[PDB]
């Protein structure tokens, strides 16, 4: 017997069902910002660069939902980390620069990152 | 030497006593009352009054205070919820005029359990450092193994 | 001055080693009956920004810890950290446990050791105590 | 003399005499090397014990992390420094660091070196990469 009216009431078991129940009550344009899904998810690619590369992808997606032309593919939500105020301190673009890569982190993360610079902006 | 051994229910007071008397680990029932026994250690005969720790009995310890040369206060080191309560019981016990000069020996017990608080931790929680008026000592024990028990009897005998 | 800041015991005793985190504010100490990892205080700075552009801190650059100073009149771009922009500020007599300018700029307060000393906004003559 | 302090007990662990205590070079974990013949590491932020390694059956005086290799170096009364992978849980290497037990190990992250100090009155250098 699953689905609660509450937030919880306690314990890992209730907690595990709860992220399933949350995805129901907001399906809309992926989870966007991953819920209690995040904990199992890292181990799913323990070998080792692939986690960061994946993580980088989600973080880029999350920033904004742009036009979505050829390699401008960022989904998730339109505003939830914006892009580009001129009063924002120390700005969004600092994280965007990582994604522009020569190899600036390692090659698996690099391939993901170049696509990801292209994708947000 | 006259000894009063108390502590909250389930701390291990009777287990301690009969380990000391019988070298045996017995199967206890909650003590509604006292057990009183005499134990020989190194030429001392300790008369130990083990007085049950559940609430009704807790209310009765004061009748065993008088004539007490030393106090063994047993603590279950694995029970963190009741440590404050132990602290509260012991603090006002320290205020008792019949217990005024009695030697104070804390047993941090069930030290055998993986998450048992350390004796140092227990010392901080019970406020033992703040006793300046009489002798105190804390001893990690395991009543089932017998660990620390005789180190206790030793310390006590040196009152 | 090597005057005793604290003495710590634990009920673990015989403390064999020490080591310190190189990024600072955790020290760990090895004992006979175990190990402890301990966290030291000071995590955050004390400072306050008035309306006179005297933003005062203590410690840091162009300011001493014992005395009091600092100013920040710079407005360069919101996207980066702005310079120190300090201008010198007069007398102090106590250590700053917390050091703060007045929110509209008329007082300065240095607080320390169970005492507060008030110094004047931009002149720093002893106003009050 | 006054100073901003606030001593807090981040994590405690009970074990036989720990000669060395370490913080992981770049991780939030602290490693303590015990006289259990075991070295144990715990991440004292989430209060999770990440891993234990049985270096010897006789005291391990020293332990440190060589974070880049993702390995830990230990020196025990085997008179060896034994190296293990702290995520693939196996012993990476075994070598005799000294003619006597190893009191402390220091790690040079910028060089392949660990120098270890031992009570054979000598300090020896080992290169993890070789």
Curated annotation (Swiss-Prot), chain A:
Function: The coatomer is a cytosolic protein complex that binds to dilysine motifs and reversibly associates with Golgi non-clathrin-coated vesicles, which further mediate biosynthetic protein transport from the ER, via the Golgi up to the trans Golgi network. Coatomer complex is required for budding from Golgi membranes, and is essential for the retrograde Golgi-to-ER transport of dilysine-tagged proteins.
Record gene name: Copb1
Localisation: Cytoplasm; Golgi apparatus membrane; Cytoplasmic vesicle, COPI-coated vesicle membrane; Cell membrane
Highest taxon in the source lineage: Eukaryota
Chain positions of HEAT repeats: 13-49, 50-87, 89-121
Name of this chain's protein: Coatomer subunit beta
Tissue: Predominantly expressed in the upper one-third of the oxyntic mucosa and in most regions of the pyloric mucosa. Ubiquitously expressed including platelet, liver, heart, spleen, lung and kidney.
Assembly description: Oligomeric complex that consists of at least the alpha, beta, beta', gamma, delta, epsilon and zeta subunits. Interacts with CAPN8. Interacts with SCYL1 and PRKCE. Interacts with COPG1. Interacts with ARF1 (myristoylated); this interaction is required for binding of COPB1 to Golgi membranes. Interacts (via trunk domain) with ARF1 (via switch I region); the interaction is direct. Interacts with KCNK2 (via N-terminus); this interaction increases the channel-mediated whole cell currents and promotes plasma membrane expression of KCNK2. Interacts with STX17. Interacts with TMEM115.
Leftover remarks: Brefeldin A induces dissociation from the Golgi of the beta-COP and presumably the other coatomer subunits.
Residues of the full protein shown: 228 to 348 of 953
From Swiss-Prot, chain B:
Alphabetically ordered keywords of this record: ER-Golgi transport, Golgi apparatus, GTP-binding, Hydrolase, Isopeptide bond, Lipoprotein, Myristate, Nucleotide-binding, Protein transport, Transport, Ubl conjugation
Keyword Metal-binding annotated: no
Domain of life, source organism: Eukaryota
Residues bound to GTP: 8-15, 31, 53, 109-112, 143-144
Effect of loss of the gene: Increases phosphatidylserine levels in the outer leaflet of the cell membrane. Simultaneous knockout of DRS2 results in inviability.
Gene Ontology cellular component list: cytoplasm; cytosol; Golgi apparatus; organelle membrane contact site; plasma membrane
Catalytic activity: GTP + H2O = GDP + phosphate + H(+)
Matches recorded under InterPro entries: Arf1-5-like, P-loop_NTPase, Small_GTP-bd, Small_GTPase_ARF, Small_GTPase_ARF/SAR
EC class: hydrolase
Record bears the keyword Hydrolase: yes
Covalent cross-link Glycyl lysine isopeptide (Lys-Gly) (interchain with G-Cter in ubiquitin), where: 110
Functional note: GTP-binding protein involved in Golgi vesicle trafficking. May modulate vesicle budding and uncoating within the Golgi apparatus. May recruit the lipid transfer protein VPS13 to Golgi membranes. Recruits polyadenylate-binding protein PAB1 to COPI vesicles, and this is required for correct localization of the asymmetrically distributed ASH1 mRNA.
Leftover remarks: Present with 19300 molecules/cell in log phase SD medium.
Family of the protein in this entry: Belongs to the small GTPase superfamily. Arf family.
Record-given protein name: ADP-ribosylation factor 1
Species whose genome carries this gene: Saccharomyces cerevisiae (strain ATCC 204508 / S288c) (Baker's yeast)
Swiss-Prot record, chain C:
UniProt note: phenotype after gene disruption: The knockout of the gene results in early embryonic lethality with no viable embryos recovered at 12.5 dpc.
Cystine residue pairs: none
Sequence ranges of the WD repeats: 91-129
Location of this chain's protein in the cell: Cytoplasm, Cytosol; Golgi apparatus membrane; Cytoplasmic vesicle, COPI-coated vesicle membrane
Similarity annotation: Belongs to the WD repeat COPB2 family.
Function as written in the Swiss-Prot or TrEMBL entry: The coatomer is a cytosolic protein complex that binds to dilysine motifs and reversibly associates with Golgi non-clathrin-coated vesicles, which further mediate biosynthetic protein transport from the ER, via the Golgi up to the trans Golgi network. Coatomer complex is required for budding from Golgi membranes, and is essential for the retrograde Golgi-to-ER transport of dilysine-tagged proteins. This coatomer complex protein, essential for Golgi budding and vesicular trafficking, is a selective binding protein (RACK) for protein kinase C, epsilon type. It binds to Golgi membranes in a GTP-dependent manner.
Known partners and oligomeric status: Oligomeric complex that consists of at least the alpha, beta, beta', gamma, delta, epsilon and zeta subunits. Probably interacts with PEX11A. Interacts with SCYL1. Interacts with JAGN1.
The protein's name: Coatomer subunit beta'
Source organism per UniProt: Mus musculus
From-to range in the entire protein, with total length: 260 to 388 of 905
């Amino acid at each position: 017997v699953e689905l609660i009216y509450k937030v919880c009431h306690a314990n890992p078991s209730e907690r595990a069902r709860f992220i399933r129940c949350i995805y129901n009550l907001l399906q809309s344009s992926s989870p966007a910002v991953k819920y209690e899904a995040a904990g199992t998810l890292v181990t799913l690619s323990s070998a080792p660069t692939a986690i960061k590369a994946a993580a980088q992808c989600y973080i880029d997606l999350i920033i904004k939902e742009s036009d979505n032309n050829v390699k401008l593919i960022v989904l998730d939500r339109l505003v939830e980390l914006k892009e580009h105020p001129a009063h924002e301190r120390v700005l969004q673009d600092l994280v965007m620069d990582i994604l522009r890569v020569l190899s600036t982190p390692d090659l698996e993360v690099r391939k993901k990152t170049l696509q990801l610079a292209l994708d947000l902006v | 030497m006259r000894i009063l051994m108390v502590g909250l229910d389930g701390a291990g007071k009777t287990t301690v006593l009969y380990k000391l008397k019988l070298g045996e680990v017995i199967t206890t029932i909650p003590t509604i009352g006292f057990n009183v026994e005499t134990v020989q250690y190194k030429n001392i005969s300790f008369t130990v009054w083990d007085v049950g720790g559940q609430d009704r009995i807790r209310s009765l310890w004061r009748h065993y205070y008088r004539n007490t040369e030393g106090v063994i206060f047993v603590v279950d080191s694995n029970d963190r919820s009741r440590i404050g309560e132990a602290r509260e019981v012991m603090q006002r016990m320290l205020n008792e005029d019949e217990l005024r000069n009695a030697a104070w020996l804390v047993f941090a017990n069930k030290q055998d359990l993986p998450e048992a608080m350390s004796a140092a931790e227990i010392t901080e929680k019970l406020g033992l450092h703040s006793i300046r008026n009489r002798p105190w000592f804390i001893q990690a024990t395991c009543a089932t193994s017998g660990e620390g028990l005789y180190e206790g009897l030793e310390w006590l005998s040196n009152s | 001055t090597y005057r005793l800041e604290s003495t710590l015991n634990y009920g673990m005793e015989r403390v064999w080693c020490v080591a310190s985190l190189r990024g600072s504010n955790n020290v760990a100490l090895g004992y006979d009956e175990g190990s402890i990892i301990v966290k030291l205080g000071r995590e955050e700075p004390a400072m306050s920004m008035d309306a006179n552009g005297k933003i005062i801190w203590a410690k840091h650059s162009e300011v001493q810890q014992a005395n009091l100073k600092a100013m920040g009149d710079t407005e360069i771009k919101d996207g980066e950290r702005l310079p120190l922009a300090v201008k010198d500020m007069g007398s102090c007599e106590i250590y700053p446990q917390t050091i703060q300018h007045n929110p509209n700029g008329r007082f300065v307060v240095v607080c320390g050791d169970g005492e507060y000393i008030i110094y004047t906004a931009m002149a720093l003559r002893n106003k009050s105590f | 003399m006054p100073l901003r302090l606030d001593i807090k007990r981040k994590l405690t662990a009970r074990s036989d005499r720990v000669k060395s205590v370490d913080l992981h070079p770049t991780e939030p974990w602290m490693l303590a090397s015990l006289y259990n013949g075991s070295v144990c590491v715990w991440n004292h932020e989430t209060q999770t014990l990440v891993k234990t390694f049985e270096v010897c059956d006789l005291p391990v005086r020293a332990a440190k992390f060589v974070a880049r290799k993702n390995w830990v170096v230990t020196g025990a009364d085997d008179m060896q420094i034994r190296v293990f992978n702290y995520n693939t849980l196996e012993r990476v290497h075994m070598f005799e660091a000294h003619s006597d037990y190893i009191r402390c190990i220091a790690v040079h992250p910028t060089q392949p070196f660990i120098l270890t100090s031992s009570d054979d009155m000598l300090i020896k250098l080992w290169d993890w990469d070789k």
